[PDB]
Amino acid sequence: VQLQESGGGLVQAGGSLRLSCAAAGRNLRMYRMGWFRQAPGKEREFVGTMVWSSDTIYYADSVKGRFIISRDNAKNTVYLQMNSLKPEDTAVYYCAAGAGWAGTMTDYNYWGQGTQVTVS
């Protein structure tokens, strides 16, 4: 799977921003897709996850109720709509893919280069 994020930039607290993750690959729709983020000097952390076969998304508590994952099927693109932004949301945001390994935890093997968001 090949991935590329876009949409990063500088935004004010309380604002909103939409990130995109374009994806290509053999059997793409069998992969679980994840958003992750790394704040400067901190450990990378999970943001949320989706599967192409379901409408149900799982979110980290840190962003649940604020960020929304959606998709455009025809464009093989996953979005992260960021709402009610806080300075602590400043980070490089990554999308990733791992085999939707059922009866086990997804191991994210494929990663984009990231898109960076600063919230003032």
Side-chain angles (χ1 to χ4, degrees):
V1 177
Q2 297 173 2
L3 304 160
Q4 187 181 70
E5 308 87 344
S6 59
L10 179 62
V11 290
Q12 283 192 308
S16 67
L17 188 69
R18 184 192 211 82
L19 308 184
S20 65
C21 168
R26 178 168 305 284
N27 305 322
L28 175 65
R29 289 184 157 71
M30 309 184 83
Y31 287 82
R32 173 173 288 284
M33 314 297 89
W35 280 98
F36 292 83
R37 68 183 183 178
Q38 184 175 43
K42 303 187 80 191
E43 291 168 0
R44 188 186 66 210
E45 62 189 31
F46 181 78
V47 174
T49 185
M50 66 148 273
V51 284
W52 295 96
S53 48
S54 170
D55 294 328
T56 200
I57 298 131
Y58 177 76
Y59 300 97
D61 275 357
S62 59
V63 305
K64 189 176 170 62
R66 300 189 301 116
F67 293 8
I68 298 288
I69 295 167
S70 59
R71 71 191 161 254
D72 183 321
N73 280 136
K75 296 174 188 158
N76 285 331
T77 296
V78 184
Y79 302 101
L80 183 68
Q81 177 65 46
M82 315 171 334
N83 311 282
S84 290
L85 283 163
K86 304 170 176 183
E88 320 87 79
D89 293 323
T90 292
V92 182
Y93 283 76
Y94 300 91
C95 69
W101 343 75
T104 177
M105 301 302 292
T106 291
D107 187 8
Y108 293 91
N109 274 244
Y110 306 104
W111 293 78
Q113 290 297 113
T115 191
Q116 194 280 144
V117 178
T118 297
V119 184
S120 58

